[PDB]
Design a protein around this ligand. Structure first.
Ligand SMILES: O=P(O)(O)OC[C@H]1O[C@H](OP(=O)(O)OP(=O)(O)O)[C@H](O)[C@@H]1O
Ligand SMILES: O=P(O)(O)OC[C@H]1O[C@H](OP(=O)(O)OP(=O)(O)O)[C@H](O)[C@@H]1O
Ligand SMILES: O=C(O)c1cc(=O)[nH]c(=O)[nH]1
Ligand SMILES: O=C(O)c1cc(=O)[nH]c(=O)[nH]1
Ligand SMILES: [Mg+2]
Ligand SMILES: [Mg+2]
Lengths: 213, 213
């Protein structure tokens, strides 16, 4: 597992974005850990998150022409990732986001920033159901842009209602790739190193057993 | 005029965010220059803008507990300013923004990020009418937070419908202070140094005559 990976977990933990306990997922599953990015709500968190996002992008080697932050949660994300790319990776890219706004019987469309033009890299925190981007791929697909990939923080890698993960469905219905900073797998790997976290280890190990993909 | 001021104008110009020509303002005035922040739509612009915003904040010496980016245009702003503060000024602050969302007969409320708590520094691009924050001070004022100030890019310093500028009204109806990176005054000062911009100088000088506050 990579260096920026390990630091990621550490920061997540630290800001208590990662928690070990007993949490009920949206799906209704009882889960032994949770990840709430909602809790990265500070200047420096923001600074730190963008730097991790950029790394991951960069380490992917995927080609893309622009960042696109969705709904609401993706804007500070796209925004921070975009500054991160240019201050540290010397990559200067265009950004863009949509107005959720739909004030008149129909949907939205409306965008802020650069033009939905080219290979678009989607950017979000987490994908639980994989439905929110399905909204957001439609916009891309309308403007005639193409999808490069999606980048999130965590791939939980557990089945959905079927036998594949929500992520595999998105990758599968969208013919794109989903990149992430960390997976379940790294989580474990990490917990393996921390002798006095064996109780969490065990529980996360067991969950991956009953539900992991 | 300050150093980060001068560089600001230069960047604005460069990205053509500042333009000299003939533009019809929202007010209906014909104006000799225009400023469209809408055109800062790139990673590095974003990086560069936050750095200018932070400077200005910092150079103000006003005390505040949090950044608040409004509607839509203020989020990447608040977001970028917040990373700027923490990476370069060693100030780590909380941020927050609202969802314009009002999906059910009434208004909104709904916030993302830290808690509307404490002395709030408002953050936006420009104030033409000064009405959009009046929406945004109501939220602050609801949650029982207090207003520290407002920070924008440019103070056009021209009268409104009355004899004072939209900014003086806001400062005046809100009992707060509005900080900015650059004013008309600096614009001129700048144009004074650039011998072959005398045509713009003249026109901006004349406008300040007929309408300046
Ligand atoms: O993969 P899904 O089940 O579709 O959900 C994933 C999304 O859940 C939240 O969306 P939300 O619409 O609540 O965020 P917002 O605050 O930006 O509106 C969060 O911002 C993720 O983007
Ligand atoms: O001082 P005023 O006349 O009220 O206007 C100033 C505002 O005009 C735009 O608001 P807008 O509501 O259009 O921006 P948005 O894209 O965030 O919705 C811009 O973002 C400024 O915030
Ligand atoms: O599946 C969930 O509902 C879920 C899990 C997680 O780690 N984080 C999140 O925001 N939702
Ligand atoms: O007053 C205007 O309408 C106006 C002027 C300006 O410089 N920028 C802007 O966005 N609006
Ligand atoms: Mg969202
Ligand atoms: Mg606005």
């Amino acid at each position: 597992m990579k260096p920026y990976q390990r630091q990621f977990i550490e920061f997540a933990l630290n800001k208590q974005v990662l928690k070990f306990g007993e949490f009920t997922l949206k799906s209704g599953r009882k889960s032994p850990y949770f990840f709430n990015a909602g809790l990265f709500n500070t200047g420096r968190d923001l600074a730190l998150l963008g730097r991790f996002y950029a790394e991951a992008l960069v380490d992917s080697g995927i080609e893309f022409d622009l960042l696109f932050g969705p709904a609401y949660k993706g804007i500070p994300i796209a925004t921070t990732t975009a500054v991160a790319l240019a201050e540290h990776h010397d990559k200067d890219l265009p950004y863009c986001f949509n107005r959720k706004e739909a004030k008149d019987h129909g949907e939205g469309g409306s965008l802020v920033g650069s033009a939905l033009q080219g290979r678009v890299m989607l950017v979000d925190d987490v994908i639980t159901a994989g439905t929110a981007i399905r909204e957001s791929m439609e916009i891309i697909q309308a403007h005639g842009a193409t999808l490069a990939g999606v980048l999130i923080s965590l791939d939980r890698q557990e089945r959905g209602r079927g036998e594949i993960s929500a992520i595999q469905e998105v990758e599968r219905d969208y013919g794109c790739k989903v990149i992430s900073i960390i997976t379940l797998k790294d989580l474990i790997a990490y917990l393996e190193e921390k002798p006095d976290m064996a109780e969490h280890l065990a529980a996360v190990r067991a969950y991956r057993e009953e539900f992991g993909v």
